Design a protein around this nucleic acid. Structure first.
Lengths: 80, 78, 123, 199
RNA sequence: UCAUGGAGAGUUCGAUCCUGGCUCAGGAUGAACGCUGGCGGCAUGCUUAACACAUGCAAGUCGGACGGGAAGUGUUUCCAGUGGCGGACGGGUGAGUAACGCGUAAGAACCUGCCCUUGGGAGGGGAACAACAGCUGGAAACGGCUGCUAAUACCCCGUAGGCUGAGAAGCAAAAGGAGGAAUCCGCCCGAGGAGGGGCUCGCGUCUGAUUAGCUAGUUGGUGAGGUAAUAGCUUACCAAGGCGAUGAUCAGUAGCUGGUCCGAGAGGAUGAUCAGCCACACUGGGACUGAGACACGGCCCAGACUCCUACGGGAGGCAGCAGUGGGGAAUUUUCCGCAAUGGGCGAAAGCCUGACGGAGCAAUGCCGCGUGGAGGCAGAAGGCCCACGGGUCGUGAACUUCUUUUCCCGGAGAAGAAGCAAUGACGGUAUCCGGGGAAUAAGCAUCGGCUAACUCUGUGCCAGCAGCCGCGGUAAGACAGAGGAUGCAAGCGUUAUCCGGAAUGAUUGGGCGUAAAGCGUCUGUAGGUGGCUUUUUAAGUCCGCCGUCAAAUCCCAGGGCUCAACCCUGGACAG
């Protein structure tokens, strides 16, 4: 399926990452149905948009490694 | 979408009618309302359309190369 | 020309900005091969001996190009680098030759405006 | 660049550039030839309002095109907003607070990294200040009293209403963006604005 | 309130008004060349020959599917082979393609391994094929008999909410592995969904009439086949249709679009990097497997070309990354790393990624910064010019102090890396602290009008300049030099391409008595526009709501890099 994954969105030596739920066959910087999330590893926030991640994980788009690790920081996981 | 109402041109083919469809269109650079005609092949198993009647085209499964519509009847609210 | 039908046929179109250099036809300046290094005269109001090199280009044309500056090294079958720009006085000369580039030396002893003539700094 | 050059030339040509590069008036031993006789084209007049602006703030002219594009880009009197984006320039403020005698003095005084702003150091003269800021010295500048020399010889002219100079704790802050009346230099905004219409 | 936008000038003539053309002032380049050249941040880097390509690398993985063997001496690491997925993604180029290829908007006739949800099932047998051993052919590339072997590999029987058929009837499947177990990964048959594809259609999609007819599987219909699915997709027969002067057919050009640039605006030109879709992979043509290709680094054939050969034969596709050669005015390093991110495989460990993350060179561009700050008797040395009085270079320098962005010499020193720890190519980079020291750092155009800047010496229709007008035949504000000035600034100029100016293709916005221009006049087809009142539908029109026009860009407002460039978050008018 769809695989919720980051994409690099920034300058050189910056690493401002989006969390996009695109199809896994696409290149890493493509297009999404809905670009759900944010991750700034230098130091800043991470907007998550919980209902849409629950929509796609409720559908069954498995995430990658560190997207899943961000999803294990917060308490997003509910099986409903 | 909409149907495409228009006159029947010539029905000398079984289950098949040519239909002129008249369409107003704004010409792009100059702002008038130019008509463009485009004629189609529609399907009818009943083939109950003579020359000169006017029908409404609705999209269906393609029947031949050109025959991709079947036309039934307009509503007729005058 | 009414808005109706003499003009949603077409007005007309102007052609282009017509090319002011029919050679050089890719882009700005192009390597040349000297064929003649003769000298012609301008039209009637002027009076000079202007020294032009008729030059074959790498494009596929052959064209008579002007040689700027005072001194010139250009003998038969040398290599130059022509550029655009119309010398008015000479009928037919459409082009210039860059000085200081390949096998066409800079002008002798010039100390005002050297970048147009390919002479490095003195002093 | 800086232009770093002969500068009474620019004062004789452009008229007296106020404060910038001198408090001394020009031609103390000079001007005894060269009648203008009254012929000056209008393009020379608008050009001299360019360089009356450009030398008085020490800008690169390409950067002045940049400030005009931002000045058009903002909403309002572009003749005034150009003299808001060139007043809240940092070394113009350090000039205006008397932290340096001249504007090359303030530009060099901020190149060698002697200014903290809100407690953080700013190494660049083209920094645009904001309302409610904080402009101080460096911690070594209570041992390096160059700023105190400038504040010693300065206080003939006081301050315009954005500034607030604190005497010994050396802090200057701007309450709000400077008003046109507030702008120190005397020139016509329309003349400069019209000149850049061509681009 | 809205408004954030619109400049002229030269040249026809003894002069004037006007038409009209040319030329310039403004931006932008993926740019090129010349002169000059300190640093930093972020981008960009064959536009030409889709032209050949040396060398290395660019796609693997799984021993927890299976059999063997080969190092290590119960224990583990490997391995060619059979299998499983991945090689259809990612990367590159724009030759073709004027067409549902693209863009946008609807639709029904379909498929879909991996991915979630869900209903049921896995008994019984059996034959080999690699590997391997032997013989043997070849220089190699590869083989060829003889035997033998295992499986999630193949075959058969039974069983099936599936299929065929009107029913009658029949038909169809399985695979084990890991673990002590627990259980987990699987497998087979179904049923949905998401995503991905395959089709169809409305509308938009370059020029040329000095290209006017085209089309006979052509356009329909049926029957037979065929496709995952509709279909002249294909075939036999019947019908004569179908397209076109609103440009068919032919010829030529061109990847397309979010966008970029310009313009006041309407819109004009254009499609590099960024991103989506298409097509190609030496030139052609085929098919095979799989879910999915007619497959860039797969197979087979033909053609051309290069290499090897022991002369019989083989091998090959850089428009992957670096690189060489040619062409060109012109476009870089045969670099480091999987640390992140994203892929592929695996139960995990991990492995592989020239994608990507970085680094190097180049002022190729955009932005920021410096080459000193303050004082400097108004006295001297000098250049140039002068009615020889002087002026101007010039506070400029010299000279006195202050400072160290940068520079040199030392110390420290990151985050980026993800809560088990460890895990960094970048790199001892960024940044900070200390010690000297004005030290290490300004050029290039122009100065007749547009167009800011001017005098002097030399030249004498010569040398030359020139964007247009035109200067140059002895005192040239136009050539050459000096001085001075101007504008710019690590850039400055020339050229080329595009838009503006240009209302010089005109809807906004032009004209036709004489300036370029009314057919010689008339009839009339197509087509265009059209009197008044009343009534009806709403196609146009207008208003509300809703869907969509990807993300990035532009606009507004915040936020982050010391600011800016750039990056990021949110929002939206238009249309």
């Amino acid at each position: 399926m769809v695989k919720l994954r980051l994409k690099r969105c920034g300058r050189k030596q910056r690493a401002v990452y989006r969390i996009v739920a695109i199809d896994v066959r696409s290149r890493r910087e493509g297009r999404d149905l809905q670009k759900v999330g944010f991750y700034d590893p230098i130091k800043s926030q991470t907007y998550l948009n919980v209902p849409a991640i629950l929509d796609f994980l409720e559908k069954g788009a498995q995430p990658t490694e560190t997207v899943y690790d961000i999803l294990k920081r917060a308490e997003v996981f509910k099986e409903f | 979408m909409r149907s495409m109402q228009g006159k029947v041109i010539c029905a000398t083919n079984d289950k098949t009618v040519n239909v002129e469809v008249v369409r107003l269109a704004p010409h792009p650079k100059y702002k008038r309302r130019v008509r463009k005609k485009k004629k189609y092949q529609a399907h009818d198993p009943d083939n109950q359309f003579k020359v000169g009647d006017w029908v409404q085209l609705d999209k269906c499964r393609p029947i031949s190369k050109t025959k991709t519509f079947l036309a039934v009847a307009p509503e007729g609210r005058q | 020309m009414p808005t109706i039908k003499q003009l949603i046929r077409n007005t007309r179109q102007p052609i282009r900005n017509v090319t002011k250099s029919p050679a050089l036809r890719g882009c700005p300046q192009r390597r040349g091969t000297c064929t003649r290094v003769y000298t012609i005269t301008p039209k009637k109001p002027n009076s000079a001996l202007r020294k032009v090199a008729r030059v074959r280009l790498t494009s596929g044309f052959e064209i008579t190009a002007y040689i700027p500056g005072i001194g010139h090294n250009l003998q038969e079958h040398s290599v130059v680098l022509v550029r655009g720009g119309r010398v008015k006085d000479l009928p037919g000369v459409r082009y210039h030759i860059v000085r200081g580039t390949l096998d066409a030396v800079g002008v002798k002893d010039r100390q005002q405006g050297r970048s147009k003539y390919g002479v490095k700094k003195p002093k | 660049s800086r232009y770093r050059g002969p500068r009474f030339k620019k004062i004789r040509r452009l008229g007296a550039l106020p404060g910038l590069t001198n408090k001394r008036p020009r031609a103390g031993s000079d001007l005894r030839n060269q009648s203008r006789s009254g012929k000056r084209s209008q393009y020379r007049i608008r050009l001299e309002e360019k360089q009356k602006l450009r030398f008085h703030y020490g800008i690169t002219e390409r950067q002045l095109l940049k400030y005009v594009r931002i000045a058009r880009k903002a909403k309002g009197s572009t003749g005034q907003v150009l003299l808001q984006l060139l007043e809240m320039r940092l070394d113009n403020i350090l000039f205006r607070l008397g932290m340096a005698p001249t504007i090359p003095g303030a530009r060099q005084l901020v190149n060698h990294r002697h200014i903290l702003v809100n407690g953080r150091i700013v190494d660049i003269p083209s920094y645009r200040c904001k309302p409610q800021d904080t402009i101080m010295a460096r911690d070594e500048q209570k041992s390096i009293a160059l700023i105190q020399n400038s504040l010693d010889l300065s206080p003939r002219e006081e301050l315009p209403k954005h500034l607030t100079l604190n005497p010994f704790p050396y802090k200057g802050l701007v309450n709000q963006i400077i008003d046109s009346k507030w702008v120190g230099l005397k020139i016509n905004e329309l003349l400069v604005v019209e000149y850049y219409s061509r681009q």
